[PDB]
Write a structure and sequence with these properties.
Two copies of one chain form a homodimer.
Chain A (H helix, E strand, L loop, with lengths): L13 E4 L5 E4 L5 E2 L5 E2 L1 H9 L3 H9 L2 H7 L3 H16 L17 H5 L30 H9 L13 H11 L24 H4 L3 H7 L10 E3 L2 E3 L3 H4 L26 H24 L5 H29 L25 H6 L10 E3 L2 E3 L1 H4 L4 H6 L2 H9 L16 H13 L5 H7 L8 H5 L3 H9 L8 H7 L10 H16 L17 H8 L3 H8 L12
Antiparallel strand pairs in A: 1-2, 3-4, 5-6, 7-8
Helix pairs in contact in A: 6-17, 6-20, 7-11, 11-12, 11-24, 12-23
The complex binds protoporphyrin IX containing FE (HEM) (2 copies), octyl beta-D-glucopyranoside (3 copies), (2R)-2-(3-fluoro-4-phenyl-phenyl)propanoic acid (FLR) (2 copies) and 2-acetamido-2-deoxy-beta-D-glucopyranose (8 copies).
The site of one protoporphyrin IX containing FE has 18 residues of chain B, from helix 7 and helix 17.
PDB class: oxidoreductase/oxidoreductase inhibitor
Keywords: flurbiprofen, OXIDOREDUCTASE-OXIDOREDUCTASE INHIBITOR complex
Assembly: dimeric
Chain lengths: 552, 552
């Protein structure tokens, strides 16, 4: 019915219904015109003949190690490059946001309501004939079928890039401050109203909760000592609501401030590290500022840890998963002479694409022992038994699984992966090809071009029947990996834009904030500007265990 | 104690304590350096020698009517000018925000917490020796004394600019969607979490409330017919909470959606106009879109009314109060090639400066009759008796009072004006001269330079004793007016930046939103781009009564 169902408008033009059976395209600012925004303006034809493809650019970035090594030591150039990556990725995101689960037209409710995840492409109208609009059968393939045929893991497939468990758990810990689905509401609703890197997973989403985790002395977070070691305080001591199975002994119910973080020792590990880091920064600030009271110590520390997080997320985490020889840079000043919006809203599709469960192993090897999921889950006593040092050491040593390439989703979390398919559809996502087009990729012409192999492709073609109806979630996990890479094109070309906006669109990166005073002086500012995953573990973990997001 | 009390840092540099008795200035990006950021960089010395003063620029803008008349008809120039006014005003506001009642250092709580009004200058530390930091006596002059000596009105003083009661009630109606102090919390806390022009005063702040005001047919707001005329529905019909004295008859309790708007027929007038305008836009959208359902009609209409409001607020309201011969422009595209943040946060100081009660007359003349405050307050039957037409006619005819120039605050609202003084101090505002410095004005050197006269100046000098301790609120109302103007320099030089950010930093002004499809097509877009206070009254009010913000 809805004449817009076929998603006729191209190149980011917007489709609007003009009567029951006709439509119109708003080609404004697209660089195109015509009934569908398919015919290019002049300058557009040139830009197109000069735009290297994602894969081309990707090759250049992962080869010529000798040349990059030289560039990386010319500030004028490194900066010039990083600036480009930042701006060119960002113009891909709508800021301020538009569209959410319930609104496929622009609307104020959509903009104002912070409870929704925003949406990079509008949902498919509720009254379209097929789930993807017009193409395909009345019903999408059985999710159980897709799961089992192309997703589930037979034999564990290690990541060729060397991603270890430090990387996998950091990914899980970090993203879980801004992916916090509100299930009381539905998928598509978030509980993280910060919509970004505000460290709510350390400090708590609400004021009431933060106060319960706080010591109110020297700006510090409450903590306990077990052995000679610092761990978070108990639910009993703080009364902060945490999610634990009823069988968990009272002294093992840790607080930390993202309620879900008790369910995996790997999460509880980072929670501890960061808690230690905060109190560490407090002792530093208190030395430079004997006149400062409890509140400002705490507030300044949180601002510093936010800095540290972004610094590390860009220069170590992203650095690693990118595979680039070019040395990425966290430098807010690169943006001070550019058009850029210091705001952000986390997109449903970012959440969806970030379900990297293939990273998980079949057992968790905390050097010495090997634990199954059942043993590992909600079992902090493991953390206490081994200590942080063993753990860092063990998790740095263990390879995580390859994400793209198909058939690597651990059976232990199959319910999750199915849910991902089901909720994708519940939220009315558009097709894989529609998202590719949305992000300046060329659409796939065959399941075989998507996977880069023959078997899974045939299996998919039997279920979906038409490449143009292939769903976004599955395609991501099944997509042909870049050469010796962990992800395919789609993952990286949707992810980077979402990721960099959430990173750089943080108030502390804005000119008013980005100055020494903001962080208690040159000494606190340095804490941000020299932060690394390595030093985070070095300053806070008992030995000074070597780490990396990289299995050496 | 707090070594930062003396506000030693100049030119917008930030002061930070570095030990109990010493301080440091962060001169980052100010254009200055040195212990206090007082000594200019080179390019700064030049910019300074070329910066015409506010009064100079103001002269040029209000004279040469012949030249402006020519410029106003050269698009390339009008646009070029408007662009400049927009960008140059805006760089005066911190965006994203910083500082609020409780935070004089940068902090995350300050940034994240939408319940606070933000603050253009930090508060004075709770442990400073004097209220203004270091200067002045242990205590500020008695508020009752300042009120009575220089504020209260003896003889009504009409505005030399011709501002009428249409202007005064529009100002009150318009600003009361974003000035909504939460008295449960304190001054310095707001209830309008939209922080800007979101038309919550028509539609309601919450979803629950909006639904109660909605008809759920053709996108329309609920309404009743009395006589043959459209007025808002009753509290009884909708159950929407409204503030009315207990003696008000049930059929006179109107709904509208800003709970306070029942307390003045001038407010209830605009509320009705805008309600009519919404349903008018719905009938239009329904014609261009027979396929559209209730929700999208409603949502698109609200987006259009938001446009109309900003269009009118800039090209008629601001136009009028400015006194400029230059024809201001509402054109979001003027910013598309500039650095500008499409966000906003309403500042406590904006609230404070906008207390324009001097505008009010001694009696409200609804042509024929003359009502006192007691008669006018919470008395909608007046609105019913006369109708909208008489009212528009009457209010266009009646001059409002001059705001600056001293001694024009109606005795009827003296409690309010005192409150303003008291709450200013409760919230720890800095001195008038500190705010002047903050907005690139030269500080006043004598009460006599501030007022431009002898009597009130001597009266003030006896109370405050030192010009550097003169409070911001009183100074605004007492300040020497620009020539035949309603406001002085300070009012206009603080106001414009706050006002324009709130206006242009609205999502609909951002490139993604500013296109025809957003508003249901070319026909809806036009409704925005041709809106005027005149046509608003023309399309909605029974005759087609002539109006203006201007007593002719
Ligand atoms: C032992 C390790 C892990 C376990 C036990 C686990 C299990 C789960 C479970 C039970 C859910 C909730 C599913 C639902 O509510 O439908 C979930 C969601 C999710 N998982 Fe994992 N997972 C693990 C590791 C990871 C890792 C390493 C990542 C890396 C990014 C990740 C990414 C996500 C994301 C983004 C969600 C979205 C949930 C939300 O929006 O709150 N997970 N996982
Ligand atoms: C009959 C006309 C008016 C009456 C009876 C009136 C009275 C009041 C009252 C009772 C308050 C709240 C007192 C308090 O919250 O402590 C207030 C606040 C305020 N008034 Fe008016 N006033 C009138 C007209 C105006 C006009 C024409 C303006 C033009 C701008 C204006 C600007 C403001 C502002 C900005 C506030 C503070 C808003 C808030 O935080 O709630 N008022 N006035
Ligand atoms: C080749 C080394 C310098 C340039 C690095 C650019 C990093 C990201 O470049 C990306 O390339 C894609 C295709 O060109 C585009 O679609 C993206 O918009 C762009 O961000
Ligand atoms: C994780 C293993 C259990 C679920 C798979 C059963 C349903 C279909 O899985 C089949 O089995 C083989 C797997 O190697 C493939 O060769 C087939 O192509 C695949 O379709
Ligand atoms: C001759 C100039 C034509 C009108 C343009 C000026 C628009 C506003 O000019 C204002 O002037 C003040 C002092 O220079 C500054 O405080 C502001 O930065 C600026 O916005
Ligand atoms: C370095 C940068 C880039 O290539 O532009 C980048 C940023 C973020 C990512 C990323 C981050 C998280 C998920 C998916 C992708 C990326 F793959 C590359
Ligand atoms: C025209 C423009 C300007 O001078 O830059 C302008 C904008 C807003 C205002 C204004 C608006 C509200 C309160 C105080 C001042 C102004 F007086 C002038
Ligand atoms: C000028 C042009 O290309 N017209 C196309 C038409 O062929 C197609 O049927 C329709 C639906 O996608 O989109 C439009
Ligand atoms: C959403 C939020 O945290 N808002 C807080 C509020 O709860 C608190 O009572 C007040 C004190 O600062 O500040 C604000
Ligand atoms: C969640 C929380 O701590 N709120 C408390 C509340 O009791 C108090 O009234 C308010 C001040 O406005 O903030 C504080
Ligand atoms: C619930 C569960 O699996 N129990 C485990 C147990 O096997 C293991 O000995 C211990 C390690 O400290 O952790 C607990
Ligand atoms: C170099 C300079 O101007 N330093 C001044 C200092 O002389 C003065 O005592 C103080 C007053 O606030 O401000 C600072
Ligand atoms: C603050 C706000 O308006 N939140 C709303 C909430 O009432 C509603 O449950 C949901 C569904 O529209 O959207 C969100
Ligand atoms: C999706 C969701 O949260 N639904 C709620 C609904 O149950 C409630 O009645 C309404 C009131 O505003 O807000 C919305
Ligand atoms: C509140 C009050 O004083 N009552 C007035 C009354 O004096 C006046 O005659 C009437 C005209 O409609 O408006 C009502």
């Amino acid at each position: 019915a809805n004449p817009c169902c076929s998603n006729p408008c191209q190149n980011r033009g917007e489709c609007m219904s003009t009567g029951f059976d006709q439509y119109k395209c708003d080609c404004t600012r697209t660089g195109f015109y015509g009934e569908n925004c398919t015919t290019p303006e002049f300058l557009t034809r040139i830009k197109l003949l000069l735009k290297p493809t994602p894969n081309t650019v990707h090759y250049i970035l992962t080869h010529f190690k000798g040349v990059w090594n030289i560039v990386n030591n010319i500030p004028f150039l490194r900066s010039l490059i990083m600036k480009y990556v930042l701006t060119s990725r960002s113009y891909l995101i709508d800021s301020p946001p538009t569209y959410n689960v319930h609104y496929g037209y622009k609307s104020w409710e959509a903009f104002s309501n912070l409870s929704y995840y925003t949406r990079a492409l509008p949902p498919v109208a509720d009254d379209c004939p097929t789930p993807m609009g017009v193409k395909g059968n009345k019903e999408l393939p059985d999710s159980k079928e897709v799961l089992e045929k192309v997703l589930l893991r037979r034999e564990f497939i290690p990541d060729p890039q060397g991603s270890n468990m430090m990387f996998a758990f950091f990914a899980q810990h970090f993203t879980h401050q801004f992916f916090k689905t509100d299930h009381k509401r539905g998928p598509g609703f978030t509980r993280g109203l910060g919509h970004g890197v505000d460290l709510n997973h350390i400090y708590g989403e609400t004021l009431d909760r933060q106060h319960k985790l706080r010591l109110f002395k020297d700006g510090k977070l409450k903590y306990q000592v077990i052995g000679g070691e610092v761990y978070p305080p108990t639910v009993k001591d703080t009364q902060v609501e945490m999610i634990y199975p009823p069988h968990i002994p009272e002294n093992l119910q840790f607080a930390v401030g993202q309620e879900v973080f008790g369910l995996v020792p790997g999460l509880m590990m980072y929670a501890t590290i960061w808690l230690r880091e905060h109190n560490r920064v407090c002792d530093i600030l208190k030395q430079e500022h004997p006149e400062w009271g409890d509140e400002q110590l705490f507030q300044t520390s949180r601002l510093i840890l936010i800095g540290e997080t972004i610094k590390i997320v860009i220069e170590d985490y992203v650095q690693h998963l990118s595979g680039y020889h070019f040395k990425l840079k966290f430098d807010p000043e690169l943006l001070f002479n550019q058009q850029f919006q210091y705001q952000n809203r986390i997109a449903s599709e970012f959440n969806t694409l970030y379900h990297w469960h293939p990273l998980l192993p079949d057992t968790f090897n905390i050097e010495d022992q090997e634990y199954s999921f059942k043993q590992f889950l909600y079992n902090n006593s493991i953390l206490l038994e081994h200590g942080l040092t063993q753990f860092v050491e063990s998790f740095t040593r263990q390879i995580a699984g390859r994400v793209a390439g198909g058939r690597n989703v651990p059976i232990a979390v199959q319910a999750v992966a199915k849910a991902s398919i089901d909720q994708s559809r519940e939220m009315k996502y558009q097709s894989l090809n529609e998202y590719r087009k949305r992000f300046s990729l060329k659409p796939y012409t065959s399941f075989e071009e998507l996977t880069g192999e023959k078997e899974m492709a045939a299996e998919l073609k039997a279920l979906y029947s038409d490449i143009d109806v292939m769903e976004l979630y599955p395609a991501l996990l099944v997509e042909k990996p870049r050469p010796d890479a962990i992800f395919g094109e789609t993952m990286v070309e949707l992810g980077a834009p979402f990721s960099l906006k959430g990173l750089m669109g943080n108030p502390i990166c804005s000119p008013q904030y980005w100055k020494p005073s903001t962080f208690g002086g040159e000494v606190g500012f340095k804490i941000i500007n020299t932060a690394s995953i390595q030093s985070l573990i070095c300053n806070n973990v008992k030995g000074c265990p070597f780490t990396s997001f990289n299995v050496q």
